[PDB]
Amino acid sequence: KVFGRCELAAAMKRHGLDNYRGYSLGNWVCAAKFESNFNTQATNRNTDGSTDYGILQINSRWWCNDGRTPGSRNLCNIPCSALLSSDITASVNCAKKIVSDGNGMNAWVAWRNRCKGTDVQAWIRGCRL
């Protein structure tokens, strides 16, 4: 599923992501924009053989099981395929664990490089929320 911007903002809010660990909704929408272009089926293979999955490009090295990342963990206790669903529940639940892990949203390198410090409220501007 390719979400629209306000559609994703609304789904993130339903699922309790807004202001989660102090990150406003525009931070999450911005991170999703640059991680996946709002596509729940986005995947990206990393040099180390791990893979990033879904709207927030959650990585198999730590967070989900894909059976093809030696030595990895599955801290969200889900198959990485669950992260590609139309329904963003698994991605949100896992993102809450990631953002709680110590470095906040810096865990998402695209957020650090493209969202951090910018006018992230633009991402929710005009949305009926």
Annotation: binding site for substrate: 101
Site membership for Cl ion, residue 58 (CB under 5 A): yes
7 is catalytic: no
Is 59 near Cl ion (CB under 5 A)?
no
Q: Please list, in sequence order, all residues whose beta carbon lies within 8 angstroms of the beta carbon of residue 42, skipping any fewer than 6 positions away.
A: 35, 36, 52, 53, 54, 55, 57
Tell me: does residue 59 bind Na ion (CB under 5 A): no
Where do we find the tokens 């006018």?
A: 119
> Which DSSP string corresponds to 61-99?
TTS-B-S-STT---TT-SBGGGGGSSSTHHHHHHHHHHH
Active site residue 87: no
Q: How far is the CB of 9 from Na ion (least distance, A)?
A: 29
CA pair distance 124, 23, nearest whole angstrom? 13
Q: Which of 24, 39, 85, 93 binds Cl ion (CB under 5 A)?
A: 24
Binding-site string for Na ion from residue 60 to residue 99, where x marks contact by CB under 5 A and - marks none: x----x---x--x-x-------------------------
Please list the active-site residues: 35, 52
Residues binding Na ion (CB under 5 A): 60, 65, 69, 72, 74
